[PDB]
Amino acid sequence: RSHFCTEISEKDVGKIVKVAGWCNTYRDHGGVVFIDLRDKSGLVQLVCDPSSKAYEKALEVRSEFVLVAKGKVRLRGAGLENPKLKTGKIEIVLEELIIENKS
Amino acid sequence: RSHFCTEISEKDVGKIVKVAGWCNTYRDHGGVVFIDLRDKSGLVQLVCDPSSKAYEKALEVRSEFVLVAKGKVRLRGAGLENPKLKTGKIEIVLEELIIENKS
Where is this site: Important for tRNA non-discrimination (chains A, B)? Predict the structure, then answer.
């Protein structure tokens, strides 16, 4: 059972959640993949590094790809909170990712 | 295998296709459900009537819900073609539908 993006907050840290949406922004810096996932409610940040089983799939993501993602909620890094997002204090550590469109 | 929404064309008439996207517009008229499904490639029309197994699920659709749909491609009926859309000569008769968000 999924959450809408903005139903996830600092209250959910430690929980495993499922979200479904589309890629608003994909970013890759220092080997770490950051995906802003958009759904009807708004945005949540997915984070994936090479130790995750989802990483290879995460690397194929492009803007507007349809994604169904599962992972654990955690706080964003020190000084990395985004005050303009409802979910801006947290991110989802990506454990599983399905790209519903082709590759 | 999915097609991107606007990869579906006249050459696909009669074939079964799978598409994934979000609801751009939901319309219900005369008991028939019309969904403009949007993905990275653009829009395609899904059509669903009460004789479809996917009808009860289709009734739950709202704008911006993430959908994964399967159905048969056909020509839009005479006079119903929409030349303002790439896929405007065709539509998908909905046979199966999954709503990936909570509905």
Answer: 29, 79
